[PDB]
Amino acid sequence: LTVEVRGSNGAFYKGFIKDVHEDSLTVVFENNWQPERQVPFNEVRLPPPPSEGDEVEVYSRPCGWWLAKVRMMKGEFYVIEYYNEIVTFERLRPVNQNKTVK
């Protein structure tokens, strides 16, 4: 089961739940950078289900989701802020509204 985990950097890394505990879960990450870990539930959420000025998330770097504002859009391009960077549609999304686990 797929999940997103808050890194110590406040960004969210994709993963899945390999095991459940009384007070932890065991996540493996969908990346070779990070190993299996027991995690507190308040650090874990579900991934989300299926415009300028917007508050969005963005895919960056091990890569994961950071909170960003679209400063300006032109052509294929979005100027975003977190630092500042020019990205394309595929690296962006509205904020994952999901809450962490209870």
Author numbering: 3 to 52, 59 to 69, 75 to 95, 102 to 121
What's written in the study?
FMRP, Fragile X Mental Retardation Protein, and its autosomal paralogues, FXR1 and FXR2 (Fragile X mental Retardation Syndrome-related Protein 1 and 2, respectively), comprise a family of RNA-binding proteins. The N-terminal region of FMRP, and the FXR1 and FXR2 paralogues, contains a nuclear localization signal between residues 1 and 184. In this work, we present the crystal structures of the NLS of the FXR1 and FXR2 paralogues and definitively classify this region as a member of the Royal Family comprising a tandem Tudor repeat. Extensive structural and biochemical analyses also suggest that this region recognizes tri-methylated protein substrates in a sequence-specific manner common to both paralogues.
The crystal structures of the N-terminal tandem Tudor domains of FXR1 and FXR2 were determined at 2.50 Å and 1.92 Å, respectively, and revealed a conserved architecture as compared with the same region of FMRP. The N-terminal Tudor domain (Tud1) spans residues 2 to 49 of FXR1 and residues 13 to 56 of the FXR2 protein. The Tudor domains tilt toward one another to generate an interdomain angle of approximately 110°. Hydrogen bonds between the mainchain atoms of F14 from Tud1 (F25 in FXR2) and W78 (W89 in FXR2) of Tud2 lend further stability to this region. Finally, the C-terminal extension comprising residues V114 to K122 (or V125 to A131 in FXR2), which fold back along the base of the tandem Tudor domains toward the N-terminus, engages in extensive interactions with the intervening segment that tethers the individual Tudor domains. The residues defining this pocket (Y95, W97, V66, and E104 for FXR1) are strictly conserved amongst the Fragile X paralogues.
